[PDB]
Symmetry: D2
Subunit: 75 residues, 4 copies
Amino acid sequence: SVSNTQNKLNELLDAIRQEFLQVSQEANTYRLQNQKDYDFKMNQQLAEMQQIRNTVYELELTHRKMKDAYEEEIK
Amino acid sequence: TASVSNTQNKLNELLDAIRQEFLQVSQEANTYRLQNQKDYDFKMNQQLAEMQQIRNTVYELELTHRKMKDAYEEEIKHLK
Amino acid sequence: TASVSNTQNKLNELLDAIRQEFLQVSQEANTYRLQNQKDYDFKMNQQLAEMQQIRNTVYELELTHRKMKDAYEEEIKH
Amino acid sequence: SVSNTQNKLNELLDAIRQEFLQVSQEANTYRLQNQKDYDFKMNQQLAEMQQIRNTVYELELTHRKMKDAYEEEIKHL
């Protein structure tokens, strides 16, 4: 009965050890997940801004070709 | 005049392209917002569930220790 | 003994301490959920205003090019 | 008035380059800020959990001190 009680205590103190080990492991895992997901969205948006900037310059180059073209319809 | 026609058609293609690029960015705002909170909540809830589990085990440890104490107090009481 | 009184003391105090510690973890988690939303929204809204400003300047730039072309169509109208 | 139109084009293209640059520099700033915020809250919770764990450790110690004492009486008697 007392030794049963001691058994209960020994089980519980192992449960506790396991529970705090799991908490520390999961913090690392979550941190890596969060970093990945944040970086994904940020790199995605950075890529999207790059594509927009490229398109703006493409528009500007194209206006220059058209202006050249009118500078030849004129000639 | 082929050059005028070509550049105009090119311009129209790029104007359409740039409109969709902007919309893809703005469209994604509520979806990224929803996902951010869903991910935050998944972690928060798991972490609270774990803390509560530790809390219960500590409580069980404490009741158990006190049961053992209720065995020594009664043997000391027999003893006397 | 006087000592058993004092270990029962530490016990009651350790138990009170652990209770406060758990409560503090739970209160912080709920406060931090709000900080997440508030912080996210501030940045989100800033990025929305900036993209819109870029979209508006690009529109002005395109409209301006239309203006120049207009000038050339009329000189050619000749 | 085309020359001025050209001035206007140049001014607006400059504004757009400056705006794109600002979006990029702000995203970089935000990324580090976000991580520092995340890391502070992660480390704070880990520290709180460490403190709880040590409080448990101590509970166990003084319980053993209580037991040990009851064991001296059971002996005495």
